Scaffold this active site. Sequence first.
Site, PDB file in Angstrom:
ATOM      1  N   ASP A   1      34.354  35.289  35.160  1.00  0.00           N
ATOM      2  CA  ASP A   1      34.065  36.757  35.564  1.00  0.00           C
ATOM      3  C   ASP A   1      34.529  37.584  34.638  1.00  0.00           C
ATOM      4  OD1 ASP A   1      33.720  38.965  36.950  1.00  0.00           O
ATOM      5  OD2 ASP A   1      35.493  38.778  38.441  1.00  0.00           O
TER       6      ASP A   1
ATOM      7  N   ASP B   1      29.321  42.712  34.294  1.00  0.00           N
ATOM      8  CA  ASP B   1      30.278  42.142  35.413  1.00  0.00           C
ATOM      9  C   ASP B   1      29.401  40.726  35.615  1.00  0.00           C
ATOM     10  OD1 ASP B   1      32.078  41.306  37.065  1.00  0.00           O
ATOM     11  OD2 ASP B   1      31.941  43.404  38.220  1.00  0.00           O
TER      12      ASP B   1
END
Lengths: 433, 433
Positions: free
Chosen positions: B144, B317
Amino acid sequence: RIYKIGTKALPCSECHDVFDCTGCLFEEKESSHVIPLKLNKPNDHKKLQKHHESLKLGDVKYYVNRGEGISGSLGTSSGNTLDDMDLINEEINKKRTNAQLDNATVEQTKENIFLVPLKHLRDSQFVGELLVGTPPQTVYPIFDTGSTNVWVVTTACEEESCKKVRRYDPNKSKTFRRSFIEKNLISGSVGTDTFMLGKHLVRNQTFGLVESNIFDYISFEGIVGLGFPGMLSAGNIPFFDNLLKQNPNVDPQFSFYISPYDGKSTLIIGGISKSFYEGDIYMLPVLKESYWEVKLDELYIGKERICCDEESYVIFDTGTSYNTMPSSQMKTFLNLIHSTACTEQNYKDILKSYPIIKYVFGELIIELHPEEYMILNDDVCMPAYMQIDVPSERNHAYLLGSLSFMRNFFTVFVRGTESRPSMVGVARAKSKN
Amino acid sequence: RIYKIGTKALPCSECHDVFDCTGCLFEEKESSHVIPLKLNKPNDHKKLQKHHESLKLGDVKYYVNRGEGISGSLGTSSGNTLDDMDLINEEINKKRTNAQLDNATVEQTKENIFLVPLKHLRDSQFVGELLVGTPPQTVYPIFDTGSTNVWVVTTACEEESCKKVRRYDPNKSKTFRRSFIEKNLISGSVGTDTFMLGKHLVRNQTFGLVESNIFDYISFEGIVGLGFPGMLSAGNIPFFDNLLKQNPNVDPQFSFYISPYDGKSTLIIGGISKSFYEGDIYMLPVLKESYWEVKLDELYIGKERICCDEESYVIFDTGTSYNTMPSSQMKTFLNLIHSTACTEQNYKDILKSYPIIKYVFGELIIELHPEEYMILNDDVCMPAYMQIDVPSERNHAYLLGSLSFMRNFFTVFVRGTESRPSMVGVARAKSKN
Ligand SMILES: *[C@@H]1O[C@H](CO)[C@@H](O)[C@H](O)[C@H]1NC(C)=O
Ligand SMILES: *[C@@H]1O[C@H](CO)[C@@H](O)[C@H](O)[C@H]1NC(C)=O
């Protein structure tokens, strides 16, 4: 374009329920009572450009109230007119920059909305000859289906330093009488006199009088209301009802041909002219007899349906130039329809991609293609629509005006009598060729 | 599509100011440290359908705060997740129907806005094998770039009635040690252990531990933060920095290939693979080292420019599926881009008219054509964008995620060292043919 979907349209005489057969065909009655309309003396659309850009931020709503404008038209008691867009924009910015300075969880909060009350929307460019009094004086009022009374601007001036211009002086009429009013109404008063519209004489006509030079505040010589009798007329027979009572062979209807670039614009009393339209005249029933107000079912911008999940109405308002939509619908509209550079010959190619605007009344369909709702301003193409909210009623009002709608459709206003309800007729205008 | 306008793009070594040459070409370094990514075990987009319709009325804004989500990701301390769209919609309606129940003149007034705080946006469908402890236990966290720390869901269960499933029990590791924290963090704690990512060993890795069955509340087995060291890490060496310190021959960069329909998705440590992209890798400088956040200059939907008159930033992201725009931009977006029926073979013909979305960073242009930002749901085509406001900063944040952006672009994240600033690289992904 105008057409009926479903069953082929039939004459309104063949209807079952006269209140329910939207799109029936009107019996055409030729009339010789023609009143030429001319351009009112400035055709400046910079005001509408600024009006559009003031909606860019999404936090500004223009509104008017039912009945509160001059002559019972849409308006407010504010001083804001559309001609005041630089004063309006300056105030909007001041107000905004003073506020930015000063099992499931949802969170309620408040955003600032800036409302701009408009004094009135009376801005048609088409006026007609009215003769007032004895010996007659000529005025050029707007003939306004969105108004109820008659108002005339008085410009009396006996001093030697007064400019030599065509003036209306009610005291030069042998037959003018001032009435007694107990309401302090720039100043207003009421009188009565004899009028002539075309070949028709109209005696004992009550009317309002505006006095102060006065055309710094007002942009029309007068207003002849062609609305309905009601509370907004207050026992004073409106002009058209008075005409009909004194000229009993006139059928209770009038029609409008708007041809801005031909000088051939015309109001027709008591009927129509077959040379002003193509195809048939399609009838919409008037739902609320006050303005000429018709129930609206849906409204499309191209494939997108923007209306109507709540009660909506179209007002046919001959005294205003632009069409209007409420504030939520114009958010969508101004995202979907952009102003652009047009020159004057590049225009048919530019607009080739713009969307068709489709008004839906029952099975009756009225389309405005882009060369019918776009107008030219300098070298810029612009949509002839304003954002106007009418908060007076819980319902939503749309306006159809002179620059866009009536320039493209011939319109008939039919007063409802003992053997008909009130109706608006629409036909494709005669193609200029 | 991706391309640079103006001067032909040159290798980033030939730059004058390394902070100013947006769109330079990245030196490609092949790496053998490949980590296959698999689909996380439900791919249901009904949640995003409902999310779009809840914006129809124009009075609802979803928001998240910088740093307040799990692992330092975007979020809030609320309990609302996107999976809660029916609880959310029920609350929105209750709140709205309780409020409608309970020289130039402008008028300030207040409208109600309903804010929906979202707990976190961690919803990628792509997970990778992480080995934890001694003897090693397998977890499948999200990798992430929008998070800072390492978190792992603990599912320890010694009772006989516990379901027999793959569990992560930190006390089965010979090398796990629990740390002392003075913050009461479903419950959280911190420990340290040894990890293996691919062929790379990472000792002394501090990480958070989530305990309660627990996957009713959480939709991921873990999060490996690939953000930046800072206040959000709090003296605990983040995973990737720890990997680099203990494996000194690894260049400080990692790359992502997302191929949802091939099973070939891959994270690459220390470099790239030339078989994952076409053309060159174009570099954007990271403006704020916290998220992988890049200055955004303009954003077009077709001919329409919707950004940027104020400071805007794009966050890359990898742990979130959908792209996002702030609340004002999605008003325009949802008017311009509609969901429609698509079947599965009718899709290329349906989208033929949809607009190209164009992100502009300096002279570097990144386009998403409609078959790149639309996804299928039942027989319905839908735009893979959410409305998310990030109010934390006065600036506006846009998110680029895995389902739309990374499925179409190969992405390289380059950590800035003594002879480079931090950068994001982008290339057209290898065409599946
Ligand atoms: C004049 O018009 C009024 C309506 O305002 C009417 O009531 C009155 O009877 C009329 N008088 C004459 C003499 O026609
Ligand atoms: C373990 O990592 C911490 C960072 O949180 C570091 O300060 C410490 O020196 C490391 N200890 C060992 C034995 O590597």
